């Protein structure tokens, strides 16, 4: 572990290390092939987000048993491009960044699986499937959202959820104009073995052309042999997932509900309002699977393939709650991701040939500031595990969405080929790292 080893007020009591690390780090370095990869993404989970959640949930000297437990660490860059000039755009969205690690090419904000010239490039998930590996795509967001969509769809705008938006916003991609289709249509073609998340709403739309013209996208999925599930009990009862019977779990109309409840941050909230304690969200029913439960099921089903598997797992609402200036929502989604990381690491340590990677798509707004801060944006005081107040600040937007930031951020890894995240890297190096680890 890397918790403080004793009394933080005494000499050495805040140390996270118990002895020299050179031998242990040598033991962590393997260049043998990866059989499997599990990539876990905390959307908007910069170093600031990791630290705030640790401080609140584990205490300043505590330790995330998942997120903090991966031994090989570095910092990576995630800048996008300006579509017209090809020059860097220093603050990416989720679409350009997910395109970078899934294809190895930089692109413009809002693009999925295409470059600045609108040309398609293959994804790591498509490549894994072509090599005979099992494939998984898990998220707490609607499945059409940028982070899961980038693995399975090639469209010129992330807004192209279904046929209706695609005809308006991506006419080159629209099925009735000869394109590959909307995000949801391309997801159904991609046919991952396991796809789990939200986003049932768009499946009520009808196709405009092709074999399933006039049928809903839900009807199409059923006709094409998918197993559709909608709650925890139906998910748990699934005993196989493969190309004959692929699994599609749709657990909410839009995004899945967050784990923790608290109030929104406000102007001078740390001064004028009481300190807050986060609580379990009553508007999340127990019939909704957790991220860790979805991860466990995916691992169980995918690991039956003896050649190997690729799995991406996204803690999507770290970012979404950071936009909403809601510390409890944001921290609870970080704690939720840590639970899923623990399931991945436990599997990987037993199996011995699995590369596990934990990172974020970009940095975000939240900052940890002094308790008496008088700031111009939105603030809130929180009562942490240590029995002390922490203040968080959201200071980069006068509009009601706090925005992404451009700082480089932590990437961490465990298992074969994990050395390739150490030092300064780029988000596009992660594509090449995964490709080489699996020998694709």
Residues placed in the known binding site: 43, 145, 147, 314, 319, 323, 361-362, 404
CB count in 10 Å sphere of residue 47: 14
Residue 274 burial by Cβ neighbours in a 10 Å radius (0-12, 13-18, 19+)? exposed
Nearest residue by C-beta to Zn ion? 94
The partner in contact with residue 73, picked from Mg ion, its own copies, Zn ion, none with C-beta cut-offs of 5 to 8 angstroms by kind, is its own copies
* Cβ atoms of residues 92 and 78 within 8 Å: yes
Residues in binding site for Mg(2+) = 43, 145, 147, 314
The residue annotated as part of the active site, out of 28, 48, 94, 287, is 94
* Interface with Mg ion, residue 43, by CB under 5 A: yes
* Contact pattern for Zn ion over residues 70 through 99, marking x by CB under 5 A: ------------------------x-----
- Which of residues 240 and 400 has its CB atom nearest to its own copies in the complex? 400
Stretch that binds Mg ion, among 61-69, 89-97, 123-131, 185-193 (CB under 5 A): 89-97
* Residues between 307 and 366 with contacts to Mg ion, criterion CB under 5 A: 316
Smallest distance from its own copies to CB 102, Å: 12
The partner in contact with residue 63, picked from Mg ion, its own copies, Zn ion, none with C-beta cut-offs of 5 to 8 angstroms by kind, is its own copies
- Which of residues 11 and 178 has its CB atom nearest to its own copies in the complex? 11
- Which of residues 351 and 403 has its CB atom nearest to its own copies in the complex? 403
In Å, the largest CA–CA distance within the chain is 72
* Residues between 300 and 319 with contacts to Zn ion, criterion CB under 5 A: 319
- Which of residues 205 and 319 has its CB atom nearest to Zn ion in the complex? 319
Collapse the DSSP code of 76 into the 3-class scheme (helix H, G, I; strand E, B; otherwise coil) and give the result: strand
The correct pick among 36, 37, 43, 318 for binding Zn ion (CB under 5 A) is 43
Q: Taking each helix axis from N to C terminus, what angle separates 327-351 and 47-58, rounded to the nearest 10 degrees?
A: 90
- 94 is a catalytic site residue: yes
Smallest distance from Zn ion to CB 92, Å: 8
CA–CA dist 188, 339 (Å, integer): 29
Smallest distance from its own copies to CB 330, Å: 14
Smallest distance from its own copies to CB 183, Å: 22
* Measured CA distances, 201 to 3, 17, 86, 143, 248 (Å): 43, 49, 35, 10, 14
Token pair recorded at residue 287: 């019939």
Contact residues for 348 (Cβ-Cβ < 8 A; gap 6+): 36, 38, 354, 355, 356, 414, 415
Contact residues for 233 (Cβ-Cβ < 8 A; gap 6+): 287
Number of residues near Zn ion (by CB under 5 A): 4
- Which of residues 36 and 107 has its CB atom nearest to Zn ion in the complex? 107
* Cβ atoms of residues 411 and 76 within 8 Å: yes
* Residues between 330 and 369 with contacts to Zn ion, criterion CB under 5 A: 361
Number of residues near Mg ion (by CB under 5 A): 4
Smallest distance from Mg ion to CB 77, Å: 18
- Give one DSSP letter per residue of 274-311, joined into a string: --B--EE-TTS-TTSPPHHHHHHHHHHHHTT-SS-EEE
Smallest distance from its own copies to CB 274, Å: 18
* Cβ atoms of residues 137 and 316 within 8 Å: no
Task: Sort strands 279-280 and 80-81 into parallel, antiparallel or unpaired.
Answer: unpaired
The partner in contact with residue 72, picked from Mg ion, Zn ion, its own copies, none with C-beta cut-offs of 5 to 8 angstroms by kind, is its own copies
CB count in 10 Å sphere of residue 222: 14
**Chain contacts with Mg ion (rule: CB under 5 A):** 43, 94, 147, 316
Q: Which residues bind Zn ion (CB under 5 A)?
A: 43, 94, 319, 361
Q: Report, as residue numbers or ranges, the catalytic residues.
A: 94
């Amino acid at each position: 572990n890397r918790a403080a080893q004793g009394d933080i007020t005494a000499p050495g009591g805040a140390r996270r290390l118990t002895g020299d690390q050179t031998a242990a780090l040598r033991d962590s370095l393997s260049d043998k092939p990866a059989k499997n990869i599990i990539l876990l993404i905390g959307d908007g989970m910069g170093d600031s987000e990791i630290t705030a959640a640790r401080n609140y949930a584990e205490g300043a000297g505590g330790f995330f048993k998942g997120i903090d437990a991966l031994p090989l660490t570095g910092q990576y860059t995630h800048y996008a491009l300006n579509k017209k000039t090809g020059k860097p755009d220093y603050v990416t969205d989720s679409a350009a960044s997910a395109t970078a690690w899934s294809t190895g090419v930089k692109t413009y904000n809002g693009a999925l699986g295409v470059d600045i010239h609108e040309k398609d490039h293959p994804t790591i998930l498509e490549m894994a499937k072509a090599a005979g590996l099992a494939t998984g795509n898990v998220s707490t967001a609607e499945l059409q959202d940028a982070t899961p969509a980038a693995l399975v769809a090639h469209v010129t705008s992330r807004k192209c959820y279904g046929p209706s938006a695609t005809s308006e916003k991506c006419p080159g991609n629209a099925l009735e104009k000869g394109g590959k289709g909307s995000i949801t249509e391309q997801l159904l073609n991609a046919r991952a073995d396991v796809t789990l998340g939200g986003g049932a709403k768009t499946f009520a739309e009808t196709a405009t052309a092709g074999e399933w013209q006039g049928k809903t996208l839900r009807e199409q999925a059923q006709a094409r042999g998918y197993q559709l599930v909608s709650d925890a009990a139906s998910l748990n009862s699934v005993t196989e997932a493969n190309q004959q019977k692929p699994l599609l779990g749709l657990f909410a109309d839009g995004n899945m509900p967050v784990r923790w409840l608290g109030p929104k941050a406000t102007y001078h909230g740390n001064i004028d309002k009481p300190a807050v304690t986060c609580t379990p969200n009553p508007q999340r029913n127990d019939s909704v699977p957790t991220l860790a439960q979805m991860t466990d099921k995916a691992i169980e089903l995918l690991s039956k393939n003896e050649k190997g598997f690729f799995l991406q797992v996204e803690g999507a609402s770290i970012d979404k709650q950071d936009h909403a200036a809601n510390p409890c929502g944001q921290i609870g989604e970080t704690v939720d991701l840590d639970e899923a990381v623990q399931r991945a690491l436990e599997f990987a340590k037993k199996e011995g040939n699995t590369l596990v990677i934990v990172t974020a798509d970009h940095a975000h707004a939240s900052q940890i500031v002094a308790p008496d801060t008088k700031a111009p944006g939105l603030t809130q005081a929180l009562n942490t595990k240590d029995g002390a107040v922490m203040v968080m600040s959201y200071g980069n937007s006068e509009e009601d969405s706090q925005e992404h930031t451009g700082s480089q951020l932590r990437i961490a890894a465990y298992g074969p080929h994990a050395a390739n995240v150490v030092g300064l890297t780029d988000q596009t190096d992660l594509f090449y790292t995964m490709k080489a680890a699996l020998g694709l």
